[PDB]
Design a protein around this ligand. Structure first.
Ligand SMILES: [Zn+2]
Ligand SMILES: [Zn+2]
Lengths: 49, 251, 64, 49, 49
């Protein structure tokens, strides 16, 4: 064990990768949400290029 | 409470306007006079302590334990530090002993064996410092329960709650009947878990279980020999066998 | 989210014409003809149905 | 037609449907007043609450 | 130009269209509270004072 890395939502390493709309609604998630942000202490952070 | 016309009986604080009112006559006696709350190298003392709390954070990080447990662990040490009766003792043992206590104080003890995993201190010395702290801080403790470790071990085996819960009853029934007045409750619990796992498709070898619990594989076998006479009746009434109790293995 | 019960400008009752409107577009009608088969002749009452987005059918997907 | 007197309006008015939006700045959030309110403690200057 | 109440970037709007749902909206807001043990005696707890 070394540590813990944050995970950007809807990536290939998220729990929402490749799900269908019948399952995205079952976890109380929006099928239209784009993804691409982190969840850090409840907040939603986005990185600026 | 006072007024020029009468000794005041009550002086309400009106936070909203920030005023002090004396209702029974009518005269603000205090004006704008009640604030409303509303709503390293330099360190010499508390420096080896600070290092010990960084090292306390490290010990509690190897297990990722919630800050509330560590919060009182730091407080326990500070207290133990302040008395300094036990000042001439190794800090890391005290930290580790503080840690064992906090888990018990949170009603979720971790085995010394576990506590040893994250520290260099011998279980013997942790237990010695532990006693000294109990005497130092003059506070009582609690007895252990098997079910408190049913969760993570069964988790570590990824066993379903039904097996996990069945084991707990088996354990619970066994201790109420004192079927095992000798073997450590964890040893007793593991055999119950074993029995439970042996009562489900999620069977595991004693050595793997033994490896997870840390107890000797013969100690489980002995503990198993003690619980086996009542293997059938020890199971909960809400259970679905994968193997008949008759077909439960012997060792 | 749900069809209003009254046109904002006239006051004519619209809230009972949403299912019949979908039923006419269902077969072959153009939006210009379905609105005439319902009796909406002022362009303030046709804006009501022509530009309505029905969000209530997507909030019924979340289990209560 | 004029709404108060029913007379016609000499000019012809340009009318039609457009798409408006409602911005976030409402007036319930920007009104505030002070009249002999709470004061600080060290410098005795007016303070909020 | 109707009665002078829409001069210099203002709008007059129909009152009996606001009464039928025009541009009506809602407004949510959340508050957090966390009980904390910052001290032995300085312990907090949710209860009716
Ligand atoms: Zn008084
Ligand atoms: Zn209309």
């Amino acid at each position: 064990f070394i540590g813990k890395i944050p995970i950007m939502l809807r990536s290939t390493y998220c729990l929402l990768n490749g799900l269908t709309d019948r399952d995205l609604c079952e976890l109380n998630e929006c099928p239209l949400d784009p993804g691409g942000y982190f969840i850090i202490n409840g907040s939603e952070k986005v990185l600026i290029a | 409470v006072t007024c020029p016309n009468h000794p005041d009986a009550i002086l309400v604080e009106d936070y909203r306007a920030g005023d002090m009112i004396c209702p029974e006559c009518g005269l603000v006696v205090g004006d704008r006079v009640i604030d409303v709350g509303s709503e390293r190298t330099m360190s010499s003392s508390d420096r080896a302590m600070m290092n010990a709390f960084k090292e306390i954070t490290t010990m509690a990080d190897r297990i990722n334990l919630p800050r509330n447990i560590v919060d009182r662990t730091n407080n326990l040490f500070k207290q133990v530090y302040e008395q300094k009766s036990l000042k001439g003792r190794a800090n890391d043992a005290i930290a580790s002993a503080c840690l064992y206590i906090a888990c018990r104080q949170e009603g979720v003890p971790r085995t010394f064996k576990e506590i040893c995993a994250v520290s260099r201190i011998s279980k013997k010395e942790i237990g010695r410092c532990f006693k000294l702290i109990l005497k130092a801080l003059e506070t009582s403790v609690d007895l252990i329960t098997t079910g408190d470790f049913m969760s993570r071990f069964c988790s570590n085996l990824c066993l379903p709650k039904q097996v996990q819960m069945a084991a707990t009853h088996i354990a619970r029934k066994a201790v109420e009947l004192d079927l095992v007045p000798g073997r450590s409750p964890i040893s007793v619990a593991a055999a119950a878990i074993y029995m439970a796992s042996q009562a489900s498709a999620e069977k595991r070898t004693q050595k793997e279980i033994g490896d997870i619990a840390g107890v000797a594989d013969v100690t489980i076998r002995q503990s198993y020999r003690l619980i086996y006479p009542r293997a059938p009746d020890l199971f909960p009434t809400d259970f679905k066998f994968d193997t008949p109790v008759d077909k439960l293995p012997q060792l | 989210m749900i069809i209003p019960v009254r046109c904002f400008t006239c006051g004519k009752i619209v809230g009972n014409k949403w299912e019949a409107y979908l039923g006419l577009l269902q077969a072959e009608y153009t939006e210009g003809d379905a609105l005439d088969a319902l009796g909406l002749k002022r362009y303030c009452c046709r804006r009501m149905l022509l530009a309505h987005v029905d969000l209530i059918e997507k909030l019924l997907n979340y289990a209560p | 037609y004029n709404g108060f007197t029913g007379r016609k309006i000499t000019s012809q008015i340009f009318i039609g449907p457009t798409y408006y939006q409602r911005l976030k700045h409402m007036v319930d959030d920007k009104i505030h007043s002070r009249a002999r309110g709470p004061i600080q403690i060290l410098n005795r200057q007016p303070m909020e609450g | 130009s109707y009665t002078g109440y829409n001069q210099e970037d203002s709008v007059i709007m129909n009152r009996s269209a606001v009464d039928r749902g025009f541009f009506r909206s809602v407004f949510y807001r959340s508050y957090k509270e966390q009980e904390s043990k910052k001290g032995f005696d300085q312990e907090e707890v949710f209860e009716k004072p």
